[PDB]
Amino acid sequence: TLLINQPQYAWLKELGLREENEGVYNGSWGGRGEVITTYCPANNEPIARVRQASVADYEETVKKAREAWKIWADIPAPKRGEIVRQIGDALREKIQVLGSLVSLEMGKILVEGVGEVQEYVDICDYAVGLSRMIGGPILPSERSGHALIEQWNPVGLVGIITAFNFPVAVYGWNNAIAMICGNVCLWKGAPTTSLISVAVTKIIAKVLEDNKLPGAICSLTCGGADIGTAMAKDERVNLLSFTGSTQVGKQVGLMVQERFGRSLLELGGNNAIIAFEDADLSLVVPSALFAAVGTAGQRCTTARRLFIHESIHDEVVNRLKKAYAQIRVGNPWDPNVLYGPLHTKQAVSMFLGAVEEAKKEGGTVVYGGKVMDRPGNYVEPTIVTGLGHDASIAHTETFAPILYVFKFKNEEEVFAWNNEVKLSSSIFTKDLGRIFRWLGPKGSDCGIVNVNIPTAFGGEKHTESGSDAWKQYMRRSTCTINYS
Amino acid sequence: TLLINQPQYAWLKELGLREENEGVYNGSWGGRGEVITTYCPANNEPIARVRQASVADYEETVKKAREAWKIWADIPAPKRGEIVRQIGDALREKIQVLGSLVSLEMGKILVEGVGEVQEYVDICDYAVGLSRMIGGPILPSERSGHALIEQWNPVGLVGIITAFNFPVAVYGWNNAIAMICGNVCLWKGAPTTSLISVAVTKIIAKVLEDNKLPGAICSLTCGGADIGTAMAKDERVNLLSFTGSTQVGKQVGLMVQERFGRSLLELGNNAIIAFEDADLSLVVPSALFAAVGTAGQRCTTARRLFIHESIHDEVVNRLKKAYAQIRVGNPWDPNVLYGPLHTKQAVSMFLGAVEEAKKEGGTVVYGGKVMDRPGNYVEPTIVTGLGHDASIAHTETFAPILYVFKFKNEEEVFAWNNEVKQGLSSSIFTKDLGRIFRWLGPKGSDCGIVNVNISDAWKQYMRRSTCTINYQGIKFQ
Amino acid sequence: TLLINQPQYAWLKELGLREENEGVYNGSWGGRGEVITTYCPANNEPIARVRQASVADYEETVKKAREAWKIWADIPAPKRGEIVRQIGDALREKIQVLGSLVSLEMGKILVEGVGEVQEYVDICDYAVGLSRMIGGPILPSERSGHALIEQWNPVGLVGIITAFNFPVAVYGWNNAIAMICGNVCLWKGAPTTSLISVAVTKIIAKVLEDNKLPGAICSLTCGGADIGTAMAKDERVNLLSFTGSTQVGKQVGLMVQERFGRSLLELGGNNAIIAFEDADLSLVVPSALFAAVGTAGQRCTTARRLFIHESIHDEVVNRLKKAYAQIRVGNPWDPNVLYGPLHTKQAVSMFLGAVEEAKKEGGTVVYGGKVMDRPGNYVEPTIVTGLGHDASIAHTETFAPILYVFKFKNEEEVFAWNNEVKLSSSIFTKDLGRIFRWLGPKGSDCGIVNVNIPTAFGGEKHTESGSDAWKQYMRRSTCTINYS
């Protein structure tokens, strides 16, 4: 029986959810596609159902969004910012139950569910101010009576495909900035976080509707691969922002390129921690633990490879091993819990596969490697030593808590090994020259680099230069005017 | 027999050119691939020969470039700017003979050959100033004692593929900006402008060498589709800048995307729109020079002219009278305006296009024929009477054919122009301010360049990183 | 008897006001200086009393503010932005009663009282986003191993002196930006709007105190000229932002310069409207009316000089005259009212003086010129013709609704006349070349220029380039680091 029909989960109704929900929103609510049940990963119990988009729903929604755009694009950017502000406030009002839904359906612990909603609120607060800054310079020409104008216009319809592990804030970032830039949006979320997508969309729909704006400015089309593929191939989707697996992302990028569209791709993270001989172990150990096992190893920023100098390799592993033992496991909505379940049963199987492959490729499981004996999708946070940095499994996209540990003897080889990889790098050392080399041209090619950083989400590290990220959701033109 | 073996073309030797030239430079000169002979399009005579890159030449050049990068990337951006400045100086010193080579091998008129080199000179001066602006903000972290640094680093090796019609300045732009950004470069130009590529590379090579820098910072691998494809597929080429045809460009972009690399693509069917209230003394000369400049072979060349029906006949008549005064001649002839098409195939394509235009109901009101003289000369051509969506008027083909269209409403002309995909520029003539705002604004043209009555580029060649660093109420120690 | 002791004005207590209020806040509330009564300008009735700062209060407050700065400056700018956000929300919660207080004590109509509070809220919303953007570039040196860093630091203590006519939002703009920039503030408001200053400070004090921050980050020292002079002369006040009369402002600027301090001065506005022969009279007439008589002619942006082409001079005057007749007069808190009283009795006397001086200098009063026969400080909105553009009275700082009208025959002379003046210019014409000349180097030297603008406060027109206004509240250093 459905969790939403059970008394203690009645709070789900505060988000407008019921036993069976419409997964399409374009000003009207609907859904003639496949009905999907989403499950609570902490106990494998069905929560509720969502009627996903058919192809016809998708087609209709795109047309309605492009119609809404005609209205929305004529609304001054600061007034668009005000709408985004109101979205932030509406999320604020529901931050506790929406956070609880994130922990329930997705599986991250409560303060991260709530904190992810907070990131969306923060982004809205930011966007209101940003909306006053959207524009380019007028420069004088070398020609008398001629003006040179850098003009920024909305791209039109921004398609947004998001992943299971951040099922609120990635949409939120894309949506807040796309909106202030004068675009309409169409969202296809992970099918296993459909209730979350529906709930967020209900909050946004109310703001739009209260402001007498067409709902399709923020359209939703819940669905699986066919819907995502349709968006990738749709010339009416002027910009496709995709976040998710490397394999699907590659195919999305190719489809967009084939039609000369624009895409923004945020793909898989095989992130490294490097601890040099002179590292502060009091910093290294807790930072590595939270980076590796936080959100059950399912962040795009999750530490999956730990390089340790051979001199301190054993001590650091021994302390991580003891630390892993003390991780508090349970339901993710229990405030005491630090470690919840993996998102799906398939995830647990992928985890088991990876662990076997690591062993066969020479690795030793010095902690974990196994499924926990309890309801839900619980696996032991896992540590593997002995592999070469070259090992195929260590460079396999697996959203599971498996930490591959590598020894190194000097700066030379460990820099080289990491340069062989093509999201974030974190180093621990007191050698300033070493830090400058790693931050400079010869170092990591990662978009995110941390230096001696001890262990809310750090959205500030994922923001073009400075505040110019809005330019990614607009198109530039150079306009030359002869007013002579 | 080769022009470069004739006394009157001895000036070619001032560029270090010989009867047969090495088309590979990576610190050393070489080339073990196929020889290519390039021809002057003004008389179809062979100029000289270039030995192109083999696959092995390519592989070795990439390796040497990546080795040079270890040295180049360590040089502070302003110092790299000074190298680029010296390149501009070296170009300036050879501007007359290099310009003449551009005119001789490619076919554009001398003032434009020289002008294109001058454009590269100006780019170098621009790049020097830019080189002191490369950097990012330190932002405050929300966490006390932590700094957020926005760091910019070179991407590494920048591959540059260029086209025949601007065989100097497009490379120049990519090379100067990529250089100040701390990248090494690898150039593959159009096979039919190989001598120009060699000559430019010789000038740059001398500057590098005189500064005791490794020459592979500005590497050359002359070749055709094989070399270009290798670059597109090569994981060692961190960024591929391609300029050229949409067909080839798409395949390049796809290949780059297949390996998660970065590409810059510059691939346009430019339109001019004259509304009823237009100043025709602006419209007619603008249309003419945009249509026939460089014999219709620019990426910005005007190929479609929309005219309000009330003024359509007059503007066409005025254009015809002005076209008749176009001064045709060899690229080096004083005061000439109009030279040859780049190739014999261009001439065939031109004739094809004219035939198709008549077949689809169009009228040739001016030109349309090959000129009976040596070289690849065709009459600059005007076609009326075609429908706006007629397949021949959207065909990407570098020929001086201007297709003219009537319109009644602002609404319909905007509609017609907004169903062209990936147009490069749109130029409008009108005195209606409201109309201008409509055309420039969100519901208007989608073109990247818009004309009315006529500094962040370095980030394209670098990679950004966000770097976070750690910098009873009483602090003891 | 005091209005605050009368039943219908009990809403004043929602702002924490009582019969006698402390006018000093520095973490503690106090005031050993002169007690002042402020009056309702609509009826001359006393509202309540405020105990202003003594010199000793002032000295103590400055020391406490500089102590608070040691704490405040160590708080990350984005966290400072969050405090400013909360101030915005706290103002929001009290926007109706605070707006009503502005209409009561200051005298502008209710939607402007409320709207002025809204401007402060808007500025706070803006500042939260701005706080993430505070910083300068790191550039590479020509010298290997050397970094060039543009560093921004708070100036320290920012003294803020404001005027009667915008007794909330000018402080608010200065305070919001100064705060995110890591400064502490000290406020001295107009003595005749002391209750407003006290109320705003109570709202801010609560936010600071709830966040366990020292209250002196946002200090208040109510007082008259001696307090303002002390601030001007105080080397501990690193930046003095002054808004008010030209005469006092000049003296403030000189005192600051004498001690090599920094000042920001916003002084008197003798603003012009120019209507050319080809102007849209349907735009000109209502725009001139609201610009001239809005807030009873007491804005820094108030239109005081109207240049009309001789061809349309008479029609435009005749229509303004008819329009003035239909202005709805009454208590400014009455939602129906468009036109309230002048702020003080002295203002009414200044008004009478100006009108007499205009007559003696050759001018004709074609409408108004007189005091209205009713309780409070009501004068007739006034129109004067016949003066030369040269007339001394027409270039006299008088916050009164007097509109001096001038004829001109051509663009030449009217541009010249205006260039003789050294805040805002508004032109009405269809001649594009004319517009470009007036906007360009040869035109107005005003900081604000409007073109055919028809008639909430336009804070966007009072914002250095773009969003760089925060630099005015910080000090720049160029730091050269040798990390080689």
Next chain:
Amino acid sequence: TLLINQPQYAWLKELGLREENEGVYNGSWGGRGEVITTYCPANNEPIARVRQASVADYEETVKKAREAWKIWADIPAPKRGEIVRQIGDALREKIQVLGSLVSLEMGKILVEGVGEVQEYVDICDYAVGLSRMIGGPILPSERSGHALIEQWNPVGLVGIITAFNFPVAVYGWNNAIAMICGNVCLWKGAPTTSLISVAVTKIIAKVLEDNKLPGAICSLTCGGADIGTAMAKDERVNLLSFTGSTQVGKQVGLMVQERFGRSLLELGNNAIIAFEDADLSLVVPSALFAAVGTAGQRCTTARRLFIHESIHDEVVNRLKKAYAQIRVGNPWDPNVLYGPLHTKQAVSMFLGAVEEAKKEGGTVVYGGKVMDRPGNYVEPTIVTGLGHDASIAHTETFAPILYVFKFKNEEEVFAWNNEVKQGLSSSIFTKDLGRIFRWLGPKGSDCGIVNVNISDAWKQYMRRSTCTINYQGIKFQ
């Protein structure tokens, strides 16, 4: 008899200098004020003479400048940039003789005289690039159909008052930026560097004239305190840039404030701080060259050196050994490091300062005496043993006297340095990262320039305006 009438100084004529020169330029050359003779500080011989501006000369020059501005302000910023570029070229062509004049009249060594002209050349190149960046954003209005344009306009006439110690480059900076920003300029330099002011103005005047521009765009009125005061009080001078002494600067700023004009003031007592963990191989040469460069007459000259007590004696001893090797000579002597003070009064002030330092308990550990040779030569000087707040060590006086102070704690040395008002720069030597962040951050130095172990400027010359313009659901018409 005048140096310029001697054969060996005939090179002065290459600058258009004569026995007596006009010190007013406003399109025409003139000067009806007092004649001044300037002297070479290396031998106290008269060089040549300049006829300065009378009040009437000043009044007429302002009028002519404001008339020139009507023309100049209409020229597009990039075109104004090109004029500035040509000025840089013209300076470069005379760089050797103009540099020698700087050395001859002002007294800094030749490599620095030439170097200062080179600085002006470099500024001109910088300004050319800046000239294409002058502009503001169009921002969206909150009101539909309305645009917010940020407009920048020239302020009009920029007055420039400069000092003796950098008699070329300070004017150069102000002039080049003010010019590209569309302003006209009026220059009054130090009376004792009048010949330098004339020579620079002759170079600029020729560029303007050859471009058919009115010469008053770059006007000159040579004079003293009377002319400077007139500029400060003159409502027609929209912006007054003053560089010089704090005493005079304050009065200038006050006079400008009295008339609601704009001023830029550049008025410093620079400190060096060596902590216990400092690299002394960095400290000693840095301290020496910063202390004695230009015989101690830069605005950046090191006058206070704080040394941790543990290393104080060693650093002092090392400085003394290095000071003894300073190569003293005439400014034109090859390989020399140290020339004369600018004036005889500077020498008197130096002797005064040395006496006062001993009187207040200081010890002269090196130098302290006049050198017994022609000209205004004094020994570069080191004084130890004084208290940090001793009145003589904070006196603004351009002399090569380095005051040395001991300290024990970071806390006390920071305290001592933070009770100096309006210090220009602070240079620290230390390997402690935490200490650096403390010194660079909000609780650290208040100096505008901070050194560790060693593009928005155009808006200063313009005025900003915010310009708002107007650009059943169905729209009819």
